[PDB]
Amino acid sequence: LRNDFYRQLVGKRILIVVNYDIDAICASRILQALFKYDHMLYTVVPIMGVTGLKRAYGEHQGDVKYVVLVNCGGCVDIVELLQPSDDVTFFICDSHRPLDVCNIYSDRQVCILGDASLEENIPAFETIFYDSEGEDSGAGESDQEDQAPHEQRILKQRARRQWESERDRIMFEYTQFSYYGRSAALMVFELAWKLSKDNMDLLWWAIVGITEQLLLGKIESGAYTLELEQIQSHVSRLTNKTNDQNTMSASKITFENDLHLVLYRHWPVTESMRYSRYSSCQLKLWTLRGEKRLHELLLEMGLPLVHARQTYGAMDLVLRKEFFSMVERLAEKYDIADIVYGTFTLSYGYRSRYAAADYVYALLAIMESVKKHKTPEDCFLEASDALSRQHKQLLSAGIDQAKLLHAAVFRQVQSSLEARQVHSAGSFFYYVLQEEHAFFSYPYALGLLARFLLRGHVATSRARQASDLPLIASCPLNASEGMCLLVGIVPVREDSPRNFFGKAFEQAAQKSGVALLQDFFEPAVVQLRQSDLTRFLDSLTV
Amino acid sequence: LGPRTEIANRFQSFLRTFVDERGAYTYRDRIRRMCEQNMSSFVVSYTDLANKEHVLAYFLPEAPFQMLEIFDKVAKDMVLSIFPTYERVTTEIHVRISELPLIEELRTFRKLHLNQLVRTLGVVTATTGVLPQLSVIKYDCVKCGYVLGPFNTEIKPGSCPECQSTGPFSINMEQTLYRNYQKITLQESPGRIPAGRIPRSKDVILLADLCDQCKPGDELEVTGIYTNNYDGSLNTDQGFPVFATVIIANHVVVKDSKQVVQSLTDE
């Protein structure tokens, strides 16, 4: 709620955007445009890690007043992290919600965006700093010698009894599981919508923001079949032209019920039915048989084979219009059910009609971990200079790069699987890897690696005993002399039951502890030494 | 007709009545096996025909053209009815035979072998390349500017959109169907000769589904059927009418088999 605070925002500021994301750029370019509206100059920021943030504030170590960070907050008791913070205006708006309340209270230098149907931590502070044992609050925080306005020292006994019996819920917070919550800038759309901004491109940008982690398999939407009311209610109800829409530029954007198979639009088919997980794994194509069952479905559709190696755009007409008009009904009965989802589309003009999510699979492929040593931040500056209507020579290069990665992905999966590199190693499953790729250096592509092997093996070689068990993976960086990256990932098909691994790896860190890092605001990640994991893995079993 | 309908109907009550290989007979599934891959070269077993209904050896030679045509109608009315989406790619079919209890060597066939079932082999030599043909009779009327309609022999009826008139005509280079074509020269092997003389030879025609399959200098197996060029200019003659000979190709088997080859048992 800043229909009241936004009228504070005229003077100088700093607009930070914590570590790379599509929520990031989407929620921030809009604010760039907003703040060049009422004549203020401002600052956009790259974060490569929390050290980059602390040196950034060090680099911005002034008394700048309206300082902002978005999509972060769970790092420290940020008053403790931040010394010169005395009365400065801070702002969070983060969807990684499970944050401690030391950051929430002290109502001078934070903004409590607390609003949810979960009144779950109301007394959560009434004993941590308010009470203490082995240390005048008139509590355990103060003296405990029968001086606080069955024995003289059962004071501490009741104190710790309450403390620990409700650490049953403190250990529930930040020590069992993590997630994200709500949108990144849909709140910001409805904020700005009071100020008469009918920027259709802003709607597209927020659609990009949601359809990243609308991936109901990756991160939950929840609002989805409710936003089929909500977002249309934003846009559809207010029609500027009931009769004049046969226009060239930026025709008022639309919504249709289509699919999430990869790049149906810009490529041929029979390679693009091959690289997604949900279509592939449920048809098992890395074995020979899957091509045959695929072929016998192509029979029932009776598309030509020659056509199925032509670009969908390049086909003749009637098939390429009737395609999805067929596929939605005679795919439900042949092992695959749930690729059809709710998304948008629009053209600028005559060139072709871009697909409302097909940018994000180019954006994820704009993470070029090149050896030039500069390119992450340049990738950011390219990305946010991409989402417009203007810069478009580069989006095609993005698509090309994306597809060649996505068809390099499988190339390792067949290699790894039928050699049976699926090491069980006890309570969970376990994977190991040997040398570097420019493909899968960084971890986004690494989770994409894991989330094809996982479905493949765990669905197809077992009974139903072990189909619900979690995942890990190595990933070496010949970049930095040997660090042996790792990421934690969840078991099958439990949308709300998300990661144990917000901290869970730290068990072995607690036991032995070896050079571990958590440099990212991302929890679902760790960083190590080159080969000092084996005994740490023997620890990290349980 | 009553009996002359039963041929296709016996094919229909064949391809789901005769069984081998412990159930799920091939032609129940061979035809869809081939409609998947977009091949349009279904093949028949003769020995299976002798196992099911031996009637189809005497009924054939009186005009095997009509036998093959009454074959192909069945594949059409099966496939394009059961895969109605199929009617896009080729929309035409014919069948093949690969089981004949006889290998007729060259220099063994005469006028008695006219227009009937054959098997023969030999070796390829030089022949033509690859060319297409015509398939249908359609003209363009030139008096009144209409088209005569759709219709080795000419037809030319007087009935047409031009008040059934315009004996004259002209022709377009489109809206009429075409057909691939190629020739061959069959010579006999230099093993099974009469031990040191010239060899003998015949020409052979193969058709559109069968091209870029053969090659100069190859081993061969063909069913074929004996042709008769109907007139090499009958007139005042030589000491012989100038008459000629070809065989028309139904189905080849190659003997080298340089591909992934054999069909598959069920178990």
UniProtKB/Swiss-Prot annotation, chain B:
Zinc finger spans (C4-type) are 141-163
Which modifications occur after translation, per UniProt?
Phosphorylated by the catalytic component of the Dbf4-dependent kinase (DDK) complex Cdc7.
Q: Superkingdom of the source? A: Eukaryota
Q: Where in the cell is it found?
A: Nucleus; Chromosome
Q: How does it assemble?
A: Component of the Mcm2-7 complex. The complex forms a toroidal hexameric ring with the proposed subunit order Mcm2-Mcm6-Mcm4-Mcm7-Mcm3-Mcm5. Interacts with Mcm10.
* Remarks, miscellaneous: Early fractionation of eukaryotic MCM proteins yielded a variety of dimeric, trimeric and tetrameric complexes with unclear biological significance. Specifically a MCM467 subcomplex is shown to have in vitro helicase activity which is inhibited by the MCM2 subunit. The MCM2-7 hexamer is the proposed physiological active complex.
The protein's role, per its UniProt record? Acts as a component of the MCM2-7 complex (MCM complex) which is the replicative helicase essential for 'once per cell cycle' DNA replication initiation and elongation in eukaryotic cells. Core component of CDC45-MCM-GINS (CMG) helicase, the molecular machine that unwinds template DNA during replication, and around which the replisome is built.
Q: State the family named in the UniProt similarity comment for this chain.
A: Belongs to the MCM family.
Identify this protein by name. DNA replication licensing factor Mcm2
Q: Which residues of the full protein are shown?
A: 174 to 444 of 887
